[PDB]
């Protein structure tokens, strides 16, 4: 019984935004995606797309215009936006344009605050956008901290973690697929191969972790630092032991046939792959960086460690890989604490009450 | 046994390009998508994406660079590109950059020739791109005509029609879904609501076709001319009889629960929806514009008619809607001639032999 | 004694905006140009530039941010913007961001209303921007009409015509330059060679006007329709009689050594070249399209005529070219009515009082 | 007696490219600027502009297309391009498109190699572009070194330094202007306020250099690091001693009324301001970074020093500021060695012989 409008980019935000809309739809709400791109068929989910046509094509203004148009045409109640720039400001304009007859909900996520908020040319813009939203939420407490530190908004930010569709991530085992990939221990890592992900360390740790255990490394994803990483596995003589799989999308099957997940980036606010992973009963070893610690509880559902500690990571890995007792327990502990505090139906309900509350 | 690289935009070209790659993959070939965007999981389909970072971000050059890099790194045999600008020229640069150790296959499609070729600032560029490709194909003979008329290239262009994944389009019936949409005759129309699609005529014809038959019009899609069309159904008192469904993606289910498809645009080189439609046993009434006539054979699998003939279209419709004999036959004739000359496995084989031939 | 901030694109708007700032500066005001681009040296004119760094680079938002920053940092009084999209909306955001402690003055001009206002994806956006500005002005009454017709804003729009720097346009004669160009009657035409300018008609009329008078045609400017026009002068055997000069900037000298100016576009809201021209004592023959009629008074300072009337234009030209009495009078009448109602110091004072008034 | 086509961005390259074209024109050559933007009036200098109209607007391809079109239409001899990406590759395409009936001259400059060449996504592209040009030159030997280090092209690169229009930079003195700015020693610094320019050090050094000498600092330019620098002069209590002048263009007058120029960036390949400066009889103190050392000969025409040596710079400054003997000599020595090896008419002749030679 609610008309919601979602806006996002079909990276991490898109996955969540889209899934949140799909869920909300199944609960009888009428969802209206307002986004230029490409997010079965639901009778209660409509897709509006921003068409553009001057120095730079006004996508921002165009998006604001469409939000406003869809808003008053479909008589939307809530307008839920997902990255901060530009969406937050666009929703503000839209609101002002339709006489403020709508409620804005802004969800923050990693880079919009982490990296964008750092840029002085957009600081005041991000602040204004946050302060002007009716309700603001973040994906992790670490983020709400980073926000008050860099942007310094005079607004309250709630915490609502991201979720995963369990109907897509289960402990199924692709034993027939391992054959199709040519293998037998499996170590999987998913990222956008950027410097911040520190993919080099995932390799270094594997170079070591491999001398004492026979296992292959699945490198899902593609990005700038690809060649460097390729050059690395190359003059490290682990070349035939790493499967660059390039960027995949349906990574659910890959995690399923995995044993250990690695995430050793310099920063991160959240981020699902951990969930996806854990969700599939796969224990993780992520760096202790703001936001990983809120999902991985050391020793119970995975392990943490300082950035750059290639050696320490390997050690922690080699140990967990042989002990099959600890590995069956951790992997179970993990997919449990996930169902526990990251249950999709649970989180969706938090957003649901936030909407009702803002009215 | 072939390493192919596909490039496209995940409009019409993307659908085909992507599907062609999926098919080729299932046949054991190793497909390498080289495109910045987002096109189950196949072990033999890799996705490489173009990352950019100056006046305008050099996407073209960047794409050329990545084609070249992937080409010689993975040792590709063929590089199959799909729209002409820029892809054709990018593949040329890529080729020149890797010492010409690769074969370029360019597939033309609607607008790249239709509208772009019209622009003098890109004429010579499109020509050069075509002439430099090793093999060039078009989606319809009408296109090969338009090409030799506007661009005037000194190269031979073959004809290879587009196809549809029958594994997605069948005569299934969503009788339970009609209920979910609130209905009972069904008339469906899919487009990007641009002036060229002449959506106004689809409405005019429906305004008439409705006075003599009770049916609702499904308007799938969203674009610039949306408001105008909305204003039209509005002061035409057919407002409660048209279901703007906004732009959908999984339109397979909608066509399934349809009876008649309309396409009355000023121009078109192909275009699938006809196929999709027909494929689902849905007879079509499209304008006699270069390229529709090669799929719709009047009276046997659908009907044609001059552009702007709102009245003639309605008449042709009202007639076919009641005669249930003619409608069961046409709908059968249609999904047959589709399996006939547009069989996915058939077309894929043509492209397959074209690759082998170019070597 | 006023701190003004100007924003524009260094086409027509830029020329005016920039000149207006230069003038205002000489009057002791402190001008602050807020624009990313490149508009002697004045101690009271500062240049702030928008730096950008995501789907599309947020130039709009960035500009809004900089307006806000400069505004409260330099404590600006007025923020004068010149095209409507995006500047109008950017100034709105800026205002809202600095607590509304600033006055927004929006000046409309041709295409922002003429062509942009036509696009439904930006209609409501242009309206909102206009309505939100504190003062709004247009360059011609024709524009204020077009505005209320297409955009339909609930705001009052004043009329303030554009001006020309007489310190740059005088009746000087470049008799030594005609030699440098290889000539002796001179017909000059300046445009962006777009279809709307109807450069073809300027040629057709010249093809005729030439059979009865020996004169060359100066085609200043460059654009899409260039080749077509080049092809035209070509198979019209006037090839050696037309001087494509390509796009020039310091056109003051060219107009100086001219005799008749032609402007036969389908539409135009203003536009200076007429002024520049007239200002140089050069009589003009422009089509009777909304906004030309407010500068050219037929027979007294030039002639008007229907669009497409190539023949009528030629006739009117050939006649005025020989009668040397009428030509000395008109050319004098013209540069007078220009000093009269378009005096730079006069118009600048209107804008000046508008600023003071808005406080 | 030569038809040359120049391509550039109206930063440093634009200044040089444009001036080079102006000079070449005065020598009787027919210059054809092929560039989308805005670079008196010369009868032998034509301006062609690239018009664009899809994912990203194909400016590169469009530029290539226009180069080709202008090339064979005007029958150009040489095509001289100035930054490497994209212009080098565009000229390659253009050449290939007109049957190679043209000679390409590529001039390298700072960032195209320095920063772009660093990016692996454009490495091979820059190399290919260089190797494919018929003649390649750089602005400094330091650059030719950086080039062979990062890009590693198999091509020969000549050295041709940048020049300055002496007809714009002379030892004139704006004593009347100092009054208009409110001053009396004058220290001037020009940059784009980027981190690489290390504007902070220019301030630190001034904070010190000021305690022992009364002088104001002219900070010409605007960029990202502006606020930080503004915050610095702020909590350094030198606030009323620094004249942020924002970004100026006609900086000739400012240098004229200056005494010492500072340039303490981490890197630089050339760069004129030194020339401009010196040219005006203003001694400079620049960091010893690859390319500054080829213009500043320590002690004879200026001083060099390690980066970050705020103290050492101040010391060197305070010393030269009082000794009025050394300051009159250095300032004279400087504007001499400039006329010496950077004489505009001299450099232009080098480029001129390079063109003739390539034929």
From Swiss-Prot, chains A, B, C, D:
Q: Where along the chain is (S)-malate bound?
A: 13, 83, 111
Cysteine pairs forming cystine bridges in this chain are none
Q: How does it assemble?
A: Dimer of tetramers.
Give a short account of what the protein does: Involved in bacillithiol (BSH) biosynthesis. Catalyzes the first step of the pathway, the formation of N-acetylglucosaminylmalate (GlcNAc-Mal) from UDP-N-acetylglucosamine (UDP-GlcNAc) and L-malate.
Superkingdom of origin: Bacteria
Keyword annotations for this protein, in alphabetical order, are: Glycosyltransferase, Nucleotide-binding, Transferase
| Organism (species) | Bacillus anthracis
- Supply the name of the protein: N-acetyl-alpha-D-glucosaminyl L-malate synthase
Record gene name: bshA
Which GO biological process categories is it annotated with?
bacillithiol biosynthetic process
Give yes or no: UniProt keyword Transferase: yes
The record's listing under Pfam families reads: Glyco_transf_4, Glycos_transf_1
**Effect of a null allele:** Mutant does not produce bacillithiol.
What is the catalytic activity of this protein? (S)-malate + UDP-N-acetyl-alpha-D-glucosamine = (S)-malyl N-acetyl-alpha-D-glucosaminide + UDP + H(+)
Q: Does the keyword Glycosyltransferase apply?
A: yes
According to its UniProt record, which protein family does this protein belong to?
Belongs to the glycosyltransferase group 1 family. Glycosyltransferase 4 subfamily.
């Amino acid at each position: 019984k609610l008309k919601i409008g979602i806006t996002c980019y079909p990276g991490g935000s898109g996955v969540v935004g889209t899934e949140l809309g799909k869920q909300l739809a199944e609960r009888g709400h009428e969802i209206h995606f307002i986004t230029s791109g490409l997010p079965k068929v639901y009778p209660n989910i409509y897709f509006h797309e921003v068409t553009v046509n001057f120095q730079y094509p006004p996508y921002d203004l165009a998006l604001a215009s469409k939000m406003a148009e869809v808003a008053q045409r479909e008589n939307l109640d809530i307008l839920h936006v997902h990255y901060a720039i530009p969406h937050a400001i666009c929703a503000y304009l839209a609101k002002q344009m339709i006489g403020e007859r709508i409620k804005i909900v802004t969800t923050l996520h990693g880079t919009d605050i982490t990296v964008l908020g750092s840029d002085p040319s957009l600081n005041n813009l991000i602040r204004f956008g946050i302060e002007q939203s009716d309700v603001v939420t973040a994906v992790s407490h670490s983020l709400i901290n980073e926000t008050h530190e860099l942007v310094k908004p005079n607004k309250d930010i709630q915490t609502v973690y991201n979720f995963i569709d369990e109907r897509v991530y289960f402990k199924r085992d692709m034993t027939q697929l391992k054959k199709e990939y040519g293998i037998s221990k499996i170590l999987i890592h998913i990222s956008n191969f950027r410097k911040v992900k520190r993919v080099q360390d995932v390799v270094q740790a594997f170079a070591k972790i491999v001398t004492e255990v026979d296992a292959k490394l699945l490198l899902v994803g593609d990005g700038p630092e690809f060649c460097t990483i390729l050059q690395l596995v190359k003059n490290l003589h682990i070349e035939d032991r790493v499967l660059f799989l390039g960027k995949q999308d349906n990574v659910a099957e890959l995690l399923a046939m995995s044993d250990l997940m690695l995430l050793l980036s310099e920063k991160e606010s959240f981020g699902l792959v951990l969930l996806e992973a854990m969700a599939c009963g796969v224990p993780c070893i992520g760096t202790r960086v703001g936001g990983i610690p809120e999902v991985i509880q050391h020793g119970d559902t995975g392990y943490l460690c300082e950035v750059g500690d290639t050696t320490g990571v390997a050690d922690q890995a080699i140990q967990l890989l042989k002990d099959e007792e600890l590995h069956r327990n951790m992997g179970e502990r993990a997919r449990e604490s996930v169902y526990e505090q990251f249950r999709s139906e649970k989180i969706v309900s938090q957003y649901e009450t936030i909407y009702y509350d803002v009215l």
